[PDB]
Design a protein around this nucleic acid. Structure first.
Ligand SMILES: [Mg+2]
Ligand SMILES: [Mg+2]
Ligand SMILES: [Mg+2]
Ligand SMILES: [Mg+2]
Ligand SMILES: [Mg+2]
Ligand SMILES: [Mg+2]
Ligand SMILES: [Mg+2]
Ligand SMILES: [Mg+2]
Ligand SMILES: [Mg+2]
Ligand SMILES: [Mg+2]
Ligand SMILES: [Mg+2]
Ligand SMILES: [Mg+2]
Ligand SMILES: [Mg+2]
Ligand SMILES: [Mg+2]
Ligand SMILES: [Mg+2]
Ligand SMILES: [Mg+2]
Ligand SMILES: [Mg+2]
Ligand SMILES: [Mg+2]
Ligand SMILES: [Mg+2]
Ligand SMILES: [Mg+2]
Ligand SMILES: [Mg+2]
Ligand SMILES: [Mg+2]
Ligand SMILES: [Mg+2]
Ligand SMILES: [Mg+2]
Ligand SMILES: [Mg+2]
Ligand SMILES: [Mg+2]
Ligand SMILES: [Mg+2]
Ligand SMILES: [Mg+2]
Ligand SMILES: [Mg+2]
Ligand SMILES: [Mg+2]
Ligand SMILES: [Mg+2]
Ligand SMILES: [Mg+2]
Ligand SMILES: [Mg+2]
Ligand SMILES: [Mg+2]
Ligand SMILES: [Mg+2]
Ligand SMILES: [Mg+2]
Ligand SMILES: [Mg+2]
Ligand SMILES: [Mg+2]
Ligand SMILES: [Mg+2]
Ligand SMILES: [Mg+2]
Ligand SMILES: [Mg+2]
Ligand SMILES: [Mg+2]
Ligand SMILES: [Mg+2]
Ligand SMILES: [Mg+2]
Ligand SMILES: [Mg+2]
Ligand SMILES: [Mg+2]
Lengths: 261, 181
RNA sequence: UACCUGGUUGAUCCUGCCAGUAGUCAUAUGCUUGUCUCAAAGAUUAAGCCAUGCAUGUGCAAGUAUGAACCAAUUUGAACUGUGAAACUGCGAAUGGCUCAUUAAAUCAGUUAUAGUUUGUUUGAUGGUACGUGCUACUCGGAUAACCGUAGUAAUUCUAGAGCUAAUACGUGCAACAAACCCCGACUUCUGGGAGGGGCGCAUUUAUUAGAUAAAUCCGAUGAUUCAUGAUAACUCGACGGAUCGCACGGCCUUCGUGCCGGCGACGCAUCAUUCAAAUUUCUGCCCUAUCAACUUUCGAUGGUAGGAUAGGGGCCUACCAUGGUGGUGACGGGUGACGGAGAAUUAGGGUUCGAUUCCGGAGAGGGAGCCUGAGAAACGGCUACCACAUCCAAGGAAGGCAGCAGGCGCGCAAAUUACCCAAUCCUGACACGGGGAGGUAGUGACAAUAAAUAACAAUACCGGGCGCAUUAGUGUCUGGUAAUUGGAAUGAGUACAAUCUAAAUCCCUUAACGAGGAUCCAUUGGAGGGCAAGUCUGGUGCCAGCAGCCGCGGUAAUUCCAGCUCCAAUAGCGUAUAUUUAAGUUGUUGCAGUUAAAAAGCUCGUAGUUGGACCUUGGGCCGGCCGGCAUCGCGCUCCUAGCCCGGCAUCGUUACUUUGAAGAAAUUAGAGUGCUCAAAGCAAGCCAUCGCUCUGGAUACAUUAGCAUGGGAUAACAUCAUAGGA
RNA sequence: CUCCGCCGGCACCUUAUGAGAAAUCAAAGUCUUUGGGUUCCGGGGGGAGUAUGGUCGCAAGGCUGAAACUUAAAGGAAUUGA
RNA sequence: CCCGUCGCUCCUACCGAUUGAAUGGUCCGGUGAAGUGUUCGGAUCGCGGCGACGGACGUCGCGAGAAGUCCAUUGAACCUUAUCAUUUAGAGGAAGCAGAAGUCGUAACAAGGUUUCCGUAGGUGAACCUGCGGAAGGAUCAUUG
RNA sequence: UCUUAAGGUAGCCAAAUGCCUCGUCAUCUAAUUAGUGACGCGCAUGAAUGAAUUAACGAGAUUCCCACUGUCCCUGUCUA
């Protein structure tokens, strides 16, 4: 082409949106934003698809034009704003809060929470480096750039981030022994504990992560995101506690729910 | 153009050797005895039978302790037991292979209606099904090939509207009453 | 369903083909056609040619409104008020739609890289100095649309001149410290100094310098950077560093003065990061052809150095230098009725063939070429020139590009309406609102695909087999049927209210009153010698007419032609033609053949290729319920994992092979759940009091090769202990 | 010269438990129970080893080598008769 | 049963004087539109200094700047010669096939009446004949007879 | 069938060899008694009277084509 592309045809959309292949020719094209448009969920989907506060593309438009919806602390009018991992979606009119985290099946969930968990998010740092006049600052994987961090926060670490004062209020030093949620691949969502990290000079490094109930799996360092120091999380895990399972097991669970029903 | 993406498929296959007496009379056995309209009705059943037998045969090449064996086999066995196409104690997935075209043709809505009474013939049953005369649970099922499940077998009955099990009389019945009056 | 049958003979067993037999999301054609659901459709020949119409514009409370209107209408101090059209300004029109002509490691796919680049926008952070002799900001420019009015030209968003008036358009111009350090440097005293006052935002270009170790105070990053970043010396005729716009009021005087404040926001400039992206870029992989064995190199072919250009690497280009680069592992060249992939048909497996087309990548807009604007274009619903084709002209000139949607001509075996709408999906703009031939809806539509009518039940029957007496009988059982026999029941094809449906319509799905005697509400297409299912029927013809895929039929008694009758197969479908798949173990990897059926080279040598004897313990076992974990006569560990002196250590040969994992676009394939009434489908839906909500789902797998990581180390490759230059 | 044994040759005879369509074959055997290695070569009968291009030769010719078209058989082994 | 020449009819392909014909592509050479950048150029247009002169001028301030022009670069397009490839005409020559109720013989299949056949060479209306070497696919599996 | 010592073989051709003859067919041209390629009942071709070919060569004969030109249309002018 001779420039950018502004359309997203439905069959080409990320599979984890669960859009239906006959519901129309196009999909919502994720606007440029803090998340990488293949690991995001736009606002249109959250309202009309999941929450069903709307029935059409135009109805979700109106809702934002009343400004009921706030994302990550700030009011967003954009229809296709790219919400992502560990954002907060809050509707003060209804008085509800959500974190965005993954199913074990690797799909975003709106995890309902109180106000006290809305005050903060978690972010992993992309890099820490000097800048104008040697003033230290850090990149996150959320687009954010925080200047003047602890000299302890190195690359790949994770930070607590108050949305009111906006600076680092805590940080986890990414290393072996903490709990992590995976944000890509076939293992995305699966939480567990770093058991080993083997590096390879000139390539990606592999993380070894084990479910609380024994099952062992591996990803590459890109798709890893520490939640808490040690076994305990610093956020509320979703409806399933990050433990992925065989197809037989959920078959057993239904009939086990179908013997009581 | 969307709606191009919708799928469609084929349901039957014509026989390789068109004209052989032994195959040909065996087919008329089934067609007449189950009250069918044409050989297409029977061929689609055999095509669907061959599908599961290939499925069941494929798992039987896999071994026990295979997750696909375990998961796929039970789902197939449930599907067979659910439609009654497999007796009790028959849960080995070697008896799916033994399954025949008779069994599928004895679970059709047409054949079950006759086996329950209500019809006086197999050929009466069908026209009795297409004339809105028979519901199943609460819905007027008007396809002679409905393939009734076991759980819905008890509720097969007349409609709540059809003169023979429902409400008011038919056109010819009202016509004769008005000409008398 | 991992399958065959007819034809060489007097007969036989073979070889071997011809012919039959099935499908095609595979095209045309013929005959026929009632219902429901579904949906392909000018690709094939001509990337041939186009009449007409449409497909791209856009406005907020938040750039500019006395230019002329509209509605308030004024108490006639101020308002152009509140809403506005036009118009200037900003942004967009580089996406989508269409097609497949050129294009054969090329596009493309998986997989890499950018430390070798640009990136409007989003999101986050960030921002002093303009001159003042840095001793704290230094003043406000005309002229242009809409409008008024004079005009020319046949001419069209052709065009000239005069009169006004706006800016977030254009051009200027105020600028925030200790100056933090650095260089001069009157004098002071002697300096290791104090120094009076002169020189320093951010960008840009160049140069110098800093950015630290290794065991008996060194302090950011990478696998790896003269990296990030800092200091210094200057250099630029600097892109920059706000003269912009909204509502809301509401604390309090300093002159009680729209009075000092001070808020939230709209737009805008600049650096870094991010995001949406591209541009190049690594490895491997593509059909047929040798009656295509050499190709490239003067004039870029392969490399070197210095430049130039680019956004940036690079012979990309220039000057000088060297003589390289590719090739039987097929270079170079030719063919392609050749865009690539995801995929499709067929499939016991292995395969064979197709892939213009709705997703992704690329390329083009009649053929070439060159450009402007812009963040982004070598753009064609932008321009400039030429080539071809053609329109108007008042004859001087002017205006062009349907491989966008519809439609016409042509070409052909071969393909729809010059319809409605932005309601859904989304996109776009200054925007909640405008627009969208994207896209959706309807008409045509037997391309394919689904479900499914054309009767059912009864008794009479001249009758027909058993079964109750079986004898001698007779009828009577499932009604098997000629039966325009007879009797009422069933119902939709149809038609019609309404409702629903829908952007509005129509169709479906519901459903008031009509809607069946069999002549009608009537089902057809191919066959009846064999292959192959079904006539030793009857009339005609007489090697004629014809049929016949093949074998064959027809010369006066034709099972084969032409007909009637009857039967056969499939059935709302069926026949024909052509390409392809199967059959075909007649392309043979699995898996064929070569004495005589086709086929061992006259014979030997020989390079490449292909293939290649044996041999090196993991052998004899302790251990706990296939395996860890170990002792035998198991080359080390300091450095990470490191047990209560200790397992389980990294470099001092390379690989295939296998094991497990990663990361792998979706759609399609397989496959779970789910009663769209079934099915093809879809991705839903199901329970609640099918009551102010509850419960949710939207699994999972295969993915040849190449690349990445993990264990194994049987097998098999290449390399290599005898100058001991070994440990 | 006679007898016995081994190795290596040219063959012959008798027989299948073998193979083959058979004639025959102790190699044409160890083949649907299909895999030792490797080279050449066939794909119904003709047209045709022809045309054309290349190349070798003094020439005669050699090597490489189609197509259009045509046709239901051609052919192999064995049987009975004539 | 069967071969070939010849006569007749049709079909397909071959050679072939004709510097044959047409079409499309490519190499080189000549001319070369338009754009882009460069060089001069400077129509007129902006403080409209000064002289402090009387809306008028020249000394003018530098800054904008058109038509044109200069040299480079990209480069359509046209023309000549050549070459390539694909079609197509041709007096005449000459192959194969098929048809038909034709002419000449008798080559082959039996010892086919001269056993057949392979290579080569020569000769003849035609099938063929003959020389030389070879084969049995022979009409001999055989001489201690 | 008459005859001869033998009856002109391979080849070649309206040829520098063909009377008829400006042979017939094709090609070159606007038009060709010319040229080239074919045909061969050859007045009267033909094999060291050598037959048929043939690259290179030729102040040898002949036909055509491009260029060139006062050869020509059609002459004029200049110098010795
Ligand atoms: Mg978007
Ligand atoms: Mg097969
Ligand atoms: Mg024969
Ligand atoms: Mg016969
Ligand atoms: Mg066939
Ligand atoms: Mg596009
Ligand atoms: Mg920003
Ligand atoms: Mg260089
Ligand atoms: Mg360079
Ligand atoms: Mg093409
Ligand atoms: Mg095409
Ligand atoms: Mg066109
Ligand atoms: Mg383009
Ligand atoms: Mg263009
Ligand atoms: Mg157009
Ligand atoms: Mg069109
Ligand atoms: Mg008929
Ligand atoms: Mg017939
Ligand atoms: Mg037949
Ligand atoms: Mg039969
Ligand atoms: Mg036929
Ligand atoms: Mg025949
Ligand atoms: Mg017949
Ligand atoms: Mg007949
Ligand atoms: Mg064979
Ligand atoms: Mg042979
Ligand atoms: Mg030999
Ligand atoms: Mg070798
Ligand atoms: Mg490998
Ligand atoms: Mg011996
Ligand atoms: Mg063959
Ligand atoms: Mg052959
Ligand atoms: Mg032979
Ligand atoms: Mg024989
Ligand atoms: Mg003879
Ligand atoms: Mg003889
Ligand atoms: Mg003989
Ligand atoms: Mg002789
Ligand atoms: Mg002669
Ligand atoms: Mg002559
Ligand atoms: Mg002449
Ligand atoms: Mg001549
Ligand atoms: Mg003479
Ligand atoms: Mg003479
Ligand atoms: Mg003489
Ligand atoms: Mg001479």
């Amino acid at each position: 082409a001779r420039g950018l592309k502004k359309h997203l045809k439905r069959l080409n959309a990320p599979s984890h949106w669960m859009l239906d292949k006959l519901g129309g020719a196009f999909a919502p094209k994720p606007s440029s934003g803090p998340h990488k448009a293949r690991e995001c969920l736009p606002l249109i989907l959250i309202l009309r698809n999941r929450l069903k506060y709307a029935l059409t593309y135009r109805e979700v438009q109106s809702i934002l034009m009343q400004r009921h919806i706030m994302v990550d602390g700030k009011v967003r009018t954009d229809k296709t704003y790219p919400a992502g991992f560990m954002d907060i979606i809050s509707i003060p009119k209804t008085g509800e809060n959500y974190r965005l985290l993954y199913d074990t099946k690797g799909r975003f969930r709106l995890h309902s929470v109180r106000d006290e968990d809305a005050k903060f998010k978690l972010c992993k740092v992309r890099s820490v480096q000097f800048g104008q006049k040697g003033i230290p600052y850090l990149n996150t994987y959320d687009g954010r750039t925080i200047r003047y961090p602890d000299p302890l926060i190195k690359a790949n670490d994770t930070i607590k981030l108050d949305l009111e004062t906006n600076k680092i209020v805590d940080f986890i030093k990414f290393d072996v022994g903490n709990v992590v949620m995976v944000t890509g691949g076939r293992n995305t969502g699966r939480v567990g504990v770093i058991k080993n990290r083997e590096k390879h000079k000139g390539t990606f490094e592999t993380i070894h992560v084990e479910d609380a109930q024994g099952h062992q799996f591996a990803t590459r360092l890109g798709n890893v995101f520490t939640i808490g120091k040690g076994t305990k999380p610093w956020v509320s895990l979703p409806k399933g506690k990050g433990i992925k399972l065989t197809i037989i097991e959920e078959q057993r669970k239904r009939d086990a729910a179908a013997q009581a029903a | 153009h969307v709606n191009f993406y919708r799928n469609y498929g084929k349901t039957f296959k014509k026989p390789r050797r068109p004209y052989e007496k032994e195959r040909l009379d065996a087919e008329l056995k089934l067609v007449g005895e189950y009250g069918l309209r044409c050989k297409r009705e029977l061929w689609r059943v055999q095509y669907a039978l061959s599908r599961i037998r290939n499925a069941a045969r494929h798992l039987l090449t896999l071994d026990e302790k295979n997750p696909r064996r375990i998961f796929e086999g039970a789902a197939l066995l449930r599907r067979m037991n659910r439609y009654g196409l497999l007796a009790e104690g028959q849960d080995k997935l070697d008896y799916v292979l033994a399954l025949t075209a008779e069994n599928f043709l004895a679970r059709r809505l047409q054949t079950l209606v006759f086996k329950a009474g209500m019809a006086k013939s197999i050929h009466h049953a069908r026209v009795l099904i297409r004339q809105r005369h028979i519901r199943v649970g609460r819905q007027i099922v008007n396809v002679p090939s409905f393939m009734v499940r076991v759980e819905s077998e008890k509720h097969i009955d007349f409609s709540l509207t059809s003169p023979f099990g429902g409400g008011p009389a038919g056109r010819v019945k009202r016509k004769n009453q008005k000409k008398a009056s």
